[PDB]
Amino acid sequence: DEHKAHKAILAYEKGWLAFSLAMLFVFIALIAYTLATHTAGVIPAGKLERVDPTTVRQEGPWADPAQAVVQTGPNQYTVYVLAFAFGYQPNPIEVPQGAEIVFKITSPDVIHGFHVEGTNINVEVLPGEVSTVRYTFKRPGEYRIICNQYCGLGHQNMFGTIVVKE
Amino acid sequence: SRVYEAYPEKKATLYFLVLGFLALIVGSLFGPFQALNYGNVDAYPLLKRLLPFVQSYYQGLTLHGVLNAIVFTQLFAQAIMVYLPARELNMRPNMGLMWLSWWMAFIGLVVFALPLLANEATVLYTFYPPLKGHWAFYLGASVFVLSTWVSIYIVLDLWRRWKAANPGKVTPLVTYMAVVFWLMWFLASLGLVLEAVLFLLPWSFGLVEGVDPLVARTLFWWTGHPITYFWLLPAYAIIYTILPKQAGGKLVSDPMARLAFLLFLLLSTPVGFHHQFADPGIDPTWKMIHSVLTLFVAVPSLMTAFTVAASLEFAGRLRGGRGLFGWIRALPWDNPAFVAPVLGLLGFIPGGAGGIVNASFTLDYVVHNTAWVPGHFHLQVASLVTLTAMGSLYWLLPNLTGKPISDAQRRLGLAVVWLWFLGMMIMAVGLHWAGLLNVPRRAYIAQVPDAYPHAAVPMVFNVLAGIVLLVALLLFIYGLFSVLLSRERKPELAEAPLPFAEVISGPEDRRLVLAMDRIGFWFAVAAILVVLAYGPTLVQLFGHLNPVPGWRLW
Amino acid sequence: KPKGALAVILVLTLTILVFWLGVYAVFFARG
Ligand code: HAS
Numbered sequence: 001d002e003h004k005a006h007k008a009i010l011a012y013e014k015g016w017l018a019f020s021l022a023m024l025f026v027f028i029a030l031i032a033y034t035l036a037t038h039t040a041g042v043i044p045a046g047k048l049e050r051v052d053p054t055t056v057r058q059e060g061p062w063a064d065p066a067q068a069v070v071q072t073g074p075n076q077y078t079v080y081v082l083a084f085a086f087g088y089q090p091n092p093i094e095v096p097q098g099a100e101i102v103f104k105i106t107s108p109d110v111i112h113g114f115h116v117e118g119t120n121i122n123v124e125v126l127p128g129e130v131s132t133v134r135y136t137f138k139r140p141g142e143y144r145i146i147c148n149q150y151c152g153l154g155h156q157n158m159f160g161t162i163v164v165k166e
Numbered sequence: 167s168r169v170y171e172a173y174p175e176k177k178a179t180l181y182f183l184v185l186g187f188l189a190l191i192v193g194s195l196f197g198p199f200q201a202l203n204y205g206n207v208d209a210y211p212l213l214k215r216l217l218p219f220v221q222s223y224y225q226g227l228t229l230h231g232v233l234n235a236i237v238f239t240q241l242f243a244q245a246i247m248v249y250l251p252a253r254e255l256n257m258r259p260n261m262g263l264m265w266l267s268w269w270m271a272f273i274g275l276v277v278f279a280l281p282l283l284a285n286e287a288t289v290l291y292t293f294y295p296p297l298k299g300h301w302a303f304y305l306g307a308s309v310f311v312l313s314t315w316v317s318i319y320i321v322l323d324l325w326r327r328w329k330a331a332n333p334g335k336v337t338p339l340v341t342y343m344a345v346v347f348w349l350m351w352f353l354a355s356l357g358l359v360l361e362a363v364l365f366l367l368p369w370s371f372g373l374v375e376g377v378d379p380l381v382a383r384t385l386f387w388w389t390g391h392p393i394t395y396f397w398l399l400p401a402y403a404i405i406y407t408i409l410p411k412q413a414g415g416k417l418v419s420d421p422m423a424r425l426a427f428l429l430f431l432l433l434s435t436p437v438g439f440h441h442q443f444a445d446p447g448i449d450p451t452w453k454m455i456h457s458v459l460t461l462f463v464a465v466p467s468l469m470t471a472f473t474v475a476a477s478l479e480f481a482g483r484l485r486g487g488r489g490l491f492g493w494i495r496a497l498p499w500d501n502p503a504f505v506a507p508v509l510g511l512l513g514f515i516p517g518g519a520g521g522i523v524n525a526s527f528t529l530d531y532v533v534h535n536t537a538w539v540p541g542h543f544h545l546q547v548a549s550l551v552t553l554t555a556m557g558s559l560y561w562l563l564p565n566l567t568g569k570p571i572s573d574a575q576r577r578l579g580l581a582v583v584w585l586w587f588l589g590m591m592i593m594a595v596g597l598h599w600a601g602l603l604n605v606p607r608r609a610y611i612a613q614v615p616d617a618y619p620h621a622a623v624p625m626v627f628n629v630l631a632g633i634v635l636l637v638a639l640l641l642f643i644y645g646l647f648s649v650l651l652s653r654e655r656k657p658e659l660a661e662a663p664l665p666f667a668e669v670i671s672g673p674e675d676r677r678l679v680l681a682m683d684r685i686g687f688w689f690a691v692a693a694i695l696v697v698l699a700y701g702p703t704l705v706q707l708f709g710h711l712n713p714v715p716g717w718r719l720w
Numbered sequence: 721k722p723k724g725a726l727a728v729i730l731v732l733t734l735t736i737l738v739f740w741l742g743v744y745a746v747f748f749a750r751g
Pocket residue numbers: 235292394395397398440441460461463464467468470471472474475478494508511512514515517518519520521522524525526530533534535539542543546547551728732
């Protein structure tokens with residue numbers, strides 16, 4: 001009775017522990033795949049790149065939003081975005097479709113979110129560090145940027161815009 | 167009471183439970199309002215009248231997370247994971263230490279409440295720099311948490327004392343659980359102790375100008391993850407060692423239960439980057455490492471899902487249920503102590519599933535910082551842990567107080583448990599879905615009513631959840647105060663043994679068990695895994711600190 | 721055979737699998 005039941009539950013448990021592990025490892029392979037393809041550009045370069053949040057709006061690349069979009073390759077743009085309480089500059093960010101966008105994002109005050117609705121760009125912005133992420137917009141139009149990290153009482157209204165030109 | 171002289175640990179455990187519960191009720195008041203908010207309904211003007219110290223949605227949210235996810239959970243863990251091993255061993259915990267632990271918790275709470283209630287620490291329960299909260303939030307919080315070190319000490323004391331009287335015996339099941347649990351917690355907690363000590367405390371007293379966000383998040387998340395397993399494992403000890411008796415059955419395997427627990431000791435801490443997938447300055451390779459490790463940590467729950475399921479099946483068969491479903495009907499659905507844990511186990515299925523999605527590195531970019539995450543964790547902690555606590559009140563409360571639970575109270579209990587459950591499932595559909603439509607977490611959305619038109623359908627679920635859960639909390643308040651403030655007493659309830667389950671014998675391998683009892687060795691291994699998973703990155707960050715000024719923006 | 725336990729861990733595996741392949745698909749749509 002019991003001794004029978006206990007052997008059988010145990011025999012099947014092992015089956016299931018082996019099946020589960022396989023499932024997990026399959027997911028590990030499937031994630032590794034994503035890592036080797038252009039869609040992985042949304043992972044931050046995990047390079048430290050320190051800056052001074054107190055001067056970032058008065059000297060260097062974030063201090064002139066109208067010049068923040070710079071061609072840096074035959075088909076590449078780099079964009080120096082500022083996330084701050086409670087907005088982003090440039091507004092809008094204007095980029096061409098089909099080009100590679102390197103977004104270099106920092107904050108002059110507190111941590112913000114940079115999440116481009118419709119895309120996989122979803123990155124934390126920490127004052128004193130630059131966040132570097134890559135994306136190619138495959139479709140023209142307007143994407144909205146949402147702040148997904150509580151930044152204070154303006155949080156709910158911190159929005160920005162990216163315009164991807166045809 | 168002469169029961170309290172023989173067992174002073176009943177009174178202490180009682181005080182933890184009560185404080186933890188008060189904390190849950192106050193914390194939960196904010197819940198329904200937040201649900202209506204994720205339903206696009208602004209009922210804050212109503213809360214602000216009922217509770218005029220609430221200046222903002224965000225101060226409510228701080229209170230909610232801190233009260234519910236930090237305080238209640240800890241008090242519950244300290245109540246369950248000291249007292250249960252004590253009773254199994256039939257030995258007195260160091261009572262001087264145990265009152266100490268409770269006072270630290272209490273004073274830390276009161277002290278942190280002060281700036282919290284006064285709008286000086288609206289930073290949420292993650293308190294990420296540069297957001298700069300009042301020094302009494304950091305100091306109260308630090309003393310509150312340190313209180314767990316005294317608990318760690320109490321249980322290891324009990325443990326060694328029994329090993330002293332019994333060399334060459336294996337540690338009993340519950341005690342083994344609690345030892346590995348407390349030792350895991352010690353490791354886990356050093357990340358936050360380091361952040362409070364080198365960074366938060368000095369900064370909040372003005373001894374340093376800034377704090378580096380990257381290094382603070384990193385140290386936070388070292389503790390941030392294993393704190394959640396710290397919330398869950400007390401519920402697991404109950405689900406393992408008490409649930410089966412309550413179901414009418416038995417624990418199908420002691421060794422498998424130790425195994426789960428051992429794996430939690432090894433894999434709860436070295437996984438924190440799964441909270442930092444979207445952070446700058448951490449090498450992708452490390453994020454892959456932690457991602458792998460996190461999928462491993464899923465294993466002991468995959469394991470637990472089968473052991474507990476099998477135990478329940480066994481119980482339902484014993485109780486005369488034939489078939490592929492008949493064992494479910496045969497279970498004691500009239501016993502709130504059975505029903506609450508089992509339901510939490512229900513929702514733990516999708517919660518675990520969401521969890522596995524979160525772990526998968528690149529998949530996190532879909533859901534990170536959206537309503538999805540709150541949907542995931544309400545299944546885990548707001549449902550399965552809390553429900554486990556609630557249900558257990560039906561045995562724990564008489565065991566500790568002597569007061570009887572009437573039939574009417576039992577039924578009220580069922581209702582609360584069920585409503586709480588259903589509300590949580592309904593809200594989990596609202597938040598997951600909402601999250602898939604890029605609605606952010608931690609936002610007073612009702613205040614921007616036209617931002618998320620696409621989310622109208624899932625919003626209605628959030629409203630519905632709001633009301634259901636208001637109803638279950640009101641029922642839970644009213645029920646909890648009947649039992650607690652009831653004239654009658656009955657001390658042989660306070661002496662009837664804890665309903666610990668019996669195991670099924672079939673030889674296990676005694677060697678597996680003996681191998682698992684090499685606790686110092688496993689603790690070593692666990693310690694090394696943290697050094698290998700954190701060391702290289704913390705060395706590189708500590709050599710490039712960039713402290714930045716703090717803000718107050720609330 | 722712990723047949724009831726097997727149903728439960730079937731439902732869990734499908735839940736996992738749907739959530740996962742569901743989210744992976746979304747990741748590629750947004751990619
Ligand atoms: C108690 C509290 C919590 C547990 C437990 C929990 C488990 C997991 N989580 Fe998590 N989650 C994450 C990973 C997972 C992983 C892989 C799991 C796993 O441990 C889950 C494994 C479990 C299973 C595989 C399910 C087994 C199911 C069982 C045991 C059911 C059995 C059914 C029976 C027996 C019924 C039978 C009876 C009948 C009658 C039929 C990560 C990322 O990798 C994030 C960050 C995402 C982001 O962008 O921030 C995260 C963030 C959160 C947050 C938010 C933190 C914040 O504020 O930012 C919290 C509080 C939290 C809570 C909790 N988490 N999690």
